[PDB]
């Protein structure tokens with residue numbers, strides 16, 4: 001159960017307050033290495049649940065800050081707007097001490113910009129809108145300590161390979177990288193080769 | 207992580223420290239948490255590198271001592287070679303002082319190994335050929351195995367023990383925990399994982 005893991009009381013409170021008590025098989029498998037700062041690839045069948053495998057480690061690794069205009073120390077990339085909002089919602093709830101900002105197309109071009117300018121600790125973004133702000137200097141990725149690629153195989157199918165690589169290339173290689181994907185197409189193995197540091201593959205095979 | 211960082215009995219931690227075993231290799235670090243909690247796993251790392259503690263410490267921690275004379279082993283480790291059976295037995299013996307480990311291997315001493323098995327054992331570390339000999343004789347009884355380990359599955363397939371391994375695993379109850387270590391997963395080994403393991407997690411540190 002989550003209380004078993006070594007997580008700050010605020011985080012356990014947040015989880016407890018929300019009913020989340022038992023990690024899914026992929027979460028239980030991935031949490032230990034992720035919490036310890038190591039790079040990993042988490043692979044499991046879609047529809048089981050794995051968001052806590054990267055959100056808890058972001059919650060735990062990052063001390064809070066109130067510095068206006070601060071750059072984000074965590075970046076989560078998702079292939080769709082609806083997943084960016086679901087993930088930003090989860091992360092916001094388990095990291096109550098962090099300012100989480102969702103970046104995604106179709107709306108809020110001005111509002112999301114303003115949010116990022118005021119300050120952010122973690123960004124959950126679709127690659128389109130994110131790359132826009134990257135090019136404008138609005139999204140600054142130079143302080144990223146944890147980068148997460150959520151559903152790498154979908155980002156490939158949606159044709160975001162170029163945006164994803166540009167975004168990762170803008171983060172410091174001192175970062176921890178986590179990659180989650182039901183399948184591992186050649187593109188994702190390459191991302192692994194090029195952007196990760198001796199990653200452990202963790203695969204719930206059946 | 208160091209070994210001290212894991213939830214292990216004090217006697218086991220003392221054993222480790224006294225031998226200057228402090229630092230799990232990458233596969234040990236990645237696999238210990240699942241193994242300790244009793245889950246099935248496949249550990250993949252390049253052949254021969256250190257991984258013995260990834261299954262030795264789970265066996266040491268899981269099994270309580272017993273005095274019963276003639277008792278059947280609660281853990282089985284299979285290895286492709288005699289030299290690997292011997293290495294692993296000594297290692298397991300070292301970190302599981304509360305258990306009686308018996309090494310079972312060909313090329314020598316049919317009677318000595320047999321008599322050791324009849325006196326009783328908690329863990330057997332075996333090569334598949336010799337082990338099947340004893341299984342069929344009724345000397346090696348696998349009906350109480352809680353942890354079964356295949357150490358270097360891809361080499362067992364290479365050495366021609368495909369059938370012997372399947373026969374040994376079949377003689378153990380499905381309620382067991384099963385740990386499979388191999389640098390590569392040929393078709394036979396995947397088939398093994400599919401049909402002999404329960405919801406296994408594959409852990410691959412080859413990178």
Ligand SMILES: Nc1ncnc2c1[nH]c(=O)n2[C@@H]1O[C@H](COP(=O)(O)OP(=O)(O)O)[C@@H](O)[C@H]1O
Nearest residue numbers: 020022023024046047048049050051052086090
């Ligand atoms: N351990 C857990 N327990 C309960 N809910 C969880 C959970 N982990 C987790 O992510 N969730 C919830 O599951 C939701 C996503 O579920 P999906 O779309 O079926 O995940 P998929 O298997 O990746 O395709 C998240 O927003 C979490 O709130």
Ligand SMILES: Nc1ncnc2c1[nH]c(=O)n2[C@@H]1O[C@H](COP(=O)(O)OP(=O)(O)O)[C@@H](O)[C@H]1O
Nearest residue numbers: 079080081082104105106126127128129130158
């Ligand atoms: N359910 C869905 N089905 C199809 N396309 C979708 C989708 N959800 C979703 O977000 N998309 C598309 O995936 C992309 C989301 O990334 P972005 O950063 O918002 O891209 P930008 O529009 O260039 O700023 C958009 O094309 C979405 O319409």
Ligand SMILES: Nc1ncnc2c1[nH]c(=O)n2[C@@H]1O[C@H](COP(=O)(O)OP(=O)(O)O)[C@@H](O)[C@H]1O
Nearest residue numbers: 227229230231234254255256257258259293297
């Ligand atoms: N955590 C650990 N620390 C020290 N020794 C260990 C160990 N785990 C483990 O199995 N051993 C021993 O290390 C031996 C394998 O080490 P090698 O041949 O030098 O290859 P390399 O690991 O690539 O450097 C095993 O036979 C064990 O007895």
Ligand SMILES: Nc1ncnc2c1[nH]c(=O)n2[C@@H]1O[C@H](COP(=O)(O)OP(=O)(O)O)[C@@H](O)[C@H]1O
Nearest residue numbers: 286287288289311312313333334335336337365
């Ligand atoms: N370094 C090595 N090189 C080649 N063969 C080896 C070997 N080490 C080793 O053990 N073998 C062979 O691997 C087999 C070990 O299994 P068994 O249970 O002893 O099988 P049995 O023949 O029924 O007694 C034997 O053939 C060993 O000679």
